[PDB]
Amino acid sequence: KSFTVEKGIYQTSNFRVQPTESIVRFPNGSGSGSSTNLVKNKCVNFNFNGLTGTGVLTESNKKFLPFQQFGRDIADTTDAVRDPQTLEILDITPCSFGGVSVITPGTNTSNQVAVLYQDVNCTEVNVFQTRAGCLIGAEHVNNSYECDIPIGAGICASYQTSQSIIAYTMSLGAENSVAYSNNSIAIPTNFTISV
Amino acid sequence: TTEILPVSMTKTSVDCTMYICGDSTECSNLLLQYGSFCTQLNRALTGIAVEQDKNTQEVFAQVKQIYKTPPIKDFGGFNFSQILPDPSKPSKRSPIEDLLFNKKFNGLTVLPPLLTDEMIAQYTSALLAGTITSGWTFGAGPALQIPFPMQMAYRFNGIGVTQNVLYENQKLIANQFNSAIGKIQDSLSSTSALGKLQDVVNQNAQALNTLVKQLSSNFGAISSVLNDILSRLDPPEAEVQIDRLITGRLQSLQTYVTQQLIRAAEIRASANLAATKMSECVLGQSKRVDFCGKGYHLMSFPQSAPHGVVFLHVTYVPAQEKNFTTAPAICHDGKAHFPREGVFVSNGT
Amino acid sequence: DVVNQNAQALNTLVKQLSSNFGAISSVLNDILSRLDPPEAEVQIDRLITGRLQSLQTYVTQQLIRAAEIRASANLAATKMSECVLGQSKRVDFCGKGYHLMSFPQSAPHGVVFLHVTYVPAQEKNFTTAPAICHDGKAHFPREGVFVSNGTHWFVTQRNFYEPQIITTDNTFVSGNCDVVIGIVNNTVYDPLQPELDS
């Protein structure tokens, strides 16, 4: 609700992979309907013998019992199904979703921004994958600096030199080995009054 | 002795729309009539997460530079192997840290903490190196090296024991220190040692489980499945049922967020206490009784732990007391003499 | 941050009035003047439930913030007592360095402490030793350290380089040379002896 934005990272929107097509399947006979081809590794609107849902269908290693048709998780949500035509187990994964945040330096500085899609592999969406999600618009840099804008999992971002947003593993401070020995001591010769 | 303190908790975030009205435009339209509850809840949770990052920063990032111990481990007979990082391990955790560390999709997500466990381990290693190589000087200004034996002599002077005692019992003191560290190792290996910390983790897990389970309830509605209601009733009745479900689920979210705020305040207090102990117990010698374990505080060593910190408090405890006759003063030539520092004692003669 | 949180809470509370909570309208008089009592009462009950819930949420959040600020005020009072009305030996409780004193200042709904502290500045290396032998007896410094610039040994206070001659006054005797590890041989000046000679 502002015409000016300070430097930082802001949670703006939500990203939600949308389904591609509807998969309706019935046993090898006639389940009072016309079956469709099975689509794997894709966000689809599946319907198995009236059990409807939306998700990604993958080949599962779970071993349903002969009489078992569906699988449920701890929260009692559809976790896997058995294809009515070929007796195989399809694991169901919720279609990728997450938050969408905007990493920006202060608008008084520049209008360039980067976008973080939280907890999503951006193969599904100047692209940098990180444990916190995928960052787009930021240039990954090997050099480590002080954390200007925190992203997460040790990754921060900053507006640096011609100027652009860079992402880097934040440094914890200068390394300073202490000249320890069994007979040497350091003593101050002067002092300062600090307020 | 060992003291364990929670520092932070999981940074949870909830997509209210997916939680209540998952995949229902009509249900989202109905949500719109309830105002800006979603924005308020998101603001609260984001504030909690930022506060968790702040808590970790306060507790651990109390050192200006990353200090490192010398390659030669000659500290006058004191063995710190059980607390210093193990160079061979890919993740440079100390054995005690290894012992410590060894011990759903309805719009709910977990944000990674800003500082990885490796960075916290680096901070702990810096603190340990500073304490070992420079005593408490690095906590005030420029780190000043000092032989560890002389440092321990100063520690003894702090608790009112003449430093000659340490120089005359150095080997015995080193043996006792090493044995105590080994006992800490064994005690953690065998032992419910992680208390309030595991309680925090369990409370958060239970809160999330309750929030998820509340979705399956009806709150009086004909069904707990939104699409069921949409596909079995006309809009005039479907909207009433959806309103009932929305009210129930929104109340559940509000309860969850309020309880999370209370827990966040509690853990903020705990992290403040942990930071105070790091400052007054590790970066110095504390004269506050029982603030750093039983006995007279000699020093402390920090160790990281899942969402928490562990302090190894090294203290001095009197062991073998003996009786003597005492007197407040002594007469020599009509004048009373009082001890400058100590007591007058008599074995009988 | 506290000020902004309070302002935002009030703004949210005010904005919640414009919502409907499922009712036909957010204006009470509108409902009163468009519906009969049997239906108006249902709509008013809906609005009342919504607004009462909003008030309850506001009050609970205010209680939580009040507890937080009570803790903050307790900390501020403790700092005023231990840092301004005295000198604190609690490390980092009154800013970096060794606490010398503190000065309070008022601020909008808050307090500011100016902590004046002493920070060592220019450190120098010296050779050290735990004790010194004079005549078979070990001497330890009463207060300070034994330091050496390479040729001579002095006794100096720990926090400020100020060499002084090692005498029987600066040090105290305990035990002998056969115990302390790293002891060094040197001379302990006795102020009395010149007077006895003179």
Numbering used by the authors:
A (entry chain A): 304 to 337, 530 to 620, 641 to 676, 689 to 722
B (entry chain B): 723 to 825, 854 to 941, 943 to 1100
C (entry chain A): 950 to 1147
Paper text:
The SARS-CoV-2 spike (S) glycoprotein is the main target for inducing neutralizing antibodies. RBD recognizes the main cellular receptor Angiotensin-converting enzyme 2 (ACE2), triggering entry by endocytosis and S2-catalyzed fusion with endosomal membranes, thereby establishing infection. The S conformation of RBD is in a dynamic equilibrium between either all RBDs in a closed, receptor-inaccessible conformation or one or two RBDs in the “up”, receptor-accessible, conformation. Up to 90% of the neutralizing antibody responses generated upon SARS-CoV-2 infection and vaccination target RBD, which is highly immunodominant.
In order to steer the immune response away from RBD epitopes to more conserved domains, we generated S glycoprotein trimers without RBD and stabilized them by formaldehyde cross-linking. The S glycoprotein construct ‘6 P’ without RBD (SΔRBD) was expressed in mammalian cells and purified by Ni2+-affinity and size exclusion chromatography (SEC). Because SΔRBD showed a Tm of 44.5 °C in comparison to 63.4 °C for S ‘6 P’, SΔRBD was stabilized by chemical cross-linking with 4% formaldehyde (FA). FA-SΔRBD revealed an increased Tm of 56.3 °C, indicating successful stabilization by cross-linking. Negative staining electron microscopy analyses demonstrated the native prefusion conformation of FA-SΔRBD, and its structure was subsequently solved at 3.2 Å resolution by cryo-electron microscopy confirming the prefusion S conformation. The structure revealed one major cross-linking site between residues R1019 of the central S2 helix and/or S2 K776 and S2 HR1 K947 from neighboring protomers, which stabilized S in the prefusion conformation. We show that the structure of S without RBD folds into the prefusion S conformation, which was stabilized by crosslinking, revealing one major site that crosslinks inter S2 subunits as reported for complete S56. FA SΔRBD was incubated with liposomes (Phosphatidylcholine 60%, cholesterol 36%, DGS-NTA 4%), and efficiently captured via its C-terminal His-tag. In summary, we show that SΔRBD VLPs are highly immunogenic and effectively redirect the immune response away from immunodominant RBD.
